Amino acid sequence: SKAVIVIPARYGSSRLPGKPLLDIVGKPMIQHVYERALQVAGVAEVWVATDDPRVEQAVQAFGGKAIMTRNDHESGTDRLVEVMHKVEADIYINLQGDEPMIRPRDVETLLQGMRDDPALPVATLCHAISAAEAAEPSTVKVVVNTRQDALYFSRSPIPYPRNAEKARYLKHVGIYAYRRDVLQNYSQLPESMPEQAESLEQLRLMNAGINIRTFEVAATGPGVDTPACLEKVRALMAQELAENA
Amino acid sequence: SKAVIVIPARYGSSRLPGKPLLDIVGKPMIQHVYERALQVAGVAEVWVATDDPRVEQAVQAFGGKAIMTRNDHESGTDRLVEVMHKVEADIYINLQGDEPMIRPRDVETLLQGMRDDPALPVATLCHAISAAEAAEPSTVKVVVNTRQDALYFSRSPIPYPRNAEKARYLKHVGIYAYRRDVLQNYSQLPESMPEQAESLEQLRLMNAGINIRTFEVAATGPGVDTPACLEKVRALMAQEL
Ligand SMILES: Nc1ccn([C@@H]2O[C@H](COP(=O)(O)OP(=O)(O)OP(=O)(O)O)[C@@H](O)[C@H]2O)c(=O)n1
Numbered sequence: 001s002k003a004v005i006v007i008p009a010r011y012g013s014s015r016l017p018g019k020p021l022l023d024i025v026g027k028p029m030i031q032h033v034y035e036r037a038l039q040v041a042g043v044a045e046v047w048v049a050t051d052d053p054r055v056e057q058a059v060q061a062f063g064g065k066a067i068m069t070r071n072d073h074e075s076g077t078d079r080l081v082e083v084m085h086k087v088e089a090d091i092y093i094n095l096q097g098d099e100p101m102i103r104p105r106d107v108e109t110l111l112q113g114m115r116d117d118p119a120l121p122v123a124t125l126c127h128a129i130s131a132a133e134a135a136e137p138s139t140v141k142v143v144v145n146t147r148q149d150a151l152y153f154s155r156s157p158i159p160y161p162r163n164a165e166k167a168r169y170l171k172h173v174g175i176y177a178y179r180r181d182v183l184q185n186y187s188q189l190p191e192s193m194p195e196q197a198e199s200l201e202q203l204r205l206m207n208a209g210i211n212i213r214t215f216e217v218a219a220t221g222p223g224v225d226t227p228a229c230l231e232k233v234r235a236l237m238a239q240e241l242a243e244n245a
Numbered sequence: 246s247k248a249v250i251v252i253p254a255r256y257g258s259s260r261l262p263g264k265p266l267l268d269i270v271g272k273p274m275i276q277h278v279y280e281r282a283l284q285v286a287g288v289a290e291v292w293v294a295t296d297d298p299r300v301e302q303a304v305q306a307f308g309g310k311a312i313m314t315r316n317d318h319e320s321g322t323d324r325l326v327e328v329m330h331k332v333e334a335d336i337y338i339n340l341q342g343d344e345p346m347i348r349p350r351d352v353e354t355l356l357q358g359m360r361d362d363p364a365l366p367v368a369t370l371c372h373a374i375s376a377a378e379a380a381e382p383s384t385v386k387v388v389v390n391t392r393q394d395a396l397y398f399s400r401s402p403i404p405y406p407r408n409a410e411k412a413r414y415l416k417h418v419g420i421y422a423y424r425r426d427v428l429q430n431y432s433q434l435p436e437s438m439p440e441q442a443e444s445l446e447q448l449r450l451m452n453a454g455i456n457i458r459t460f461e462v463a464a465t466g467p468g469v470d471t472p473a474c475l476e477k478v479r480a481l482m483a484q485e486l
């Protein structure tokens with residue numbers, strides 16, 4: 001059971017042009033993610049999937065493996081599918097190039113879940129959040145059943161707070177583990193109405209009846225999207241370097 | 246493949262005490278529902294499950310079959326579980342006693358669905374509604390997949406309208422078709438967090454991993470909960486004559 005980690009990293013960004021190359025305690029953001037992916041036990045290879053040569057070069061500079069992909073990919077899953085045809089593996093894990101504070105143990109939880117159930121097509125992560133945070137459409141909520149299988153993903157607060165005291169919210173952490181066969185049949189999947197309405201690609205899978213199991217982890221670190229969150233990550237990343245005893 | 250229709254009809258109601266016995270164009274509400282259930286092809290028996298002697302007598306007065314059930318049930322589903330032990334069938338259909346405008350063809354669509362797929366445990370109905378009607382917490386929304394299997398039921402507008410013109414909404418019509426084995430294992434199912442927060446009993450089923458297929462029909466008539474709805478249904482059923 002070979003597993004590889006693919007880190008999609010595209011340069012072009014509106015509010016942060018060249019986001020993966022941003023400096024954080026003296027290292028390009030893309031390098032922090034790569035260094036952490038390497039600490040995940042059970043993974044044979046780690047690749048960075050990009051559509052820009054400036055990113056491919058920055059990756060080669062620190063000795064990381066980069067593979068150029070097409071710029072016409074409408075999603076990070078389409079990019080993983082292209083990488084899949086060239087890089088062989090039974091399990092592909094998709095890590096976000098913009099989340100430098102990822103915990104290697106969290107990825108291992110995901111990988112172990114995939115290995116403990118050969119029939120599981122896709123696996124993802126989630127963590128508890130308060131009702132106030134669930135109110136934000138920018139946050140993706142997930143409701144699961146007893147087997148921790150996702151029932152639905154939405155920007156609307158689910159479950160609805162009819163009896164508010166009983167409601168417990170889960171935030172979806174955008175890291176996925178895909179079985180090789182799911183990626184082979186992916187491009188043949190049609191876009192669903194819920195996917196297009198919510199603008200959540202993972203719903204394309206649910207539309208086709210593909211099961212997505214969601215594992216719960218602790219509150220993850222803040223992702224880099226806005227400069228206000230960047231300073232916190234730089235200070236949080238810095239506070240982390242001088243922390244041991 | 247034997248199928249029976251059970252109509253849970255308790256006497257009590259917070260706004261309309263004695264609801265099933267309320268007169269509508271000359272007949273108690275329960276009679277309208279019973280008469281329509283009899284028009285559904287492929288059904289072997291129609292039963293009215295009640296907790297009150299007054300309702301039982303009224304049913305027998307018009308030629309209907311009635312069964313006395315316990316008064317300690319909090320749901321019309323638990324009332325159906327009690328009936329399942331007394332009335333043997335492969336498929337049980339649960340019709341609401343307060344929806345006299347039910348179309349017999351809509352129940353046939355549901356029954357046909359159960360018969361076309363022996364593996365299907367539960368089936369229910371739905372119809373399209375506007376984005377406006379969907380914003381209401383009192384209306385239950387459902388989102389389905391390609392096989393029309395329900396992904397989730399919520400009072401929240403789902404799918405969330407990020408791209409408004411792409412969003413299409415479905416209202417859940419509260420009629421169910423249950424396979425016998427589902428009802429036999431019902432009392433063993435634990436209440437779920439989503440069920441308790443949303444106050445939607447069908448979520449107890451989804452939490453257990455039981456598939457619920459949703460069939461789409463045309464917009465349905467209103468039920469009778471409040472005295473305002475009762476006058477509207479009376480007006481409607483009158484002009485339908
Ligand atoms: N404990 C209960 C609750 C409801 N029902 C039945 O379920 C059907 C409609 O559902 P419901 O909306 O729950 O009826 P209500 O009594 O109005 O309950 P609620 O106020 O929660 O809506 C009716 O035929 C009613 O008799 C029942 O048999 N036993």
Ligand SMILES: [Mg+2]
Nearest residue numbers: 257258259260
């Ligand atoms: Mg009531």
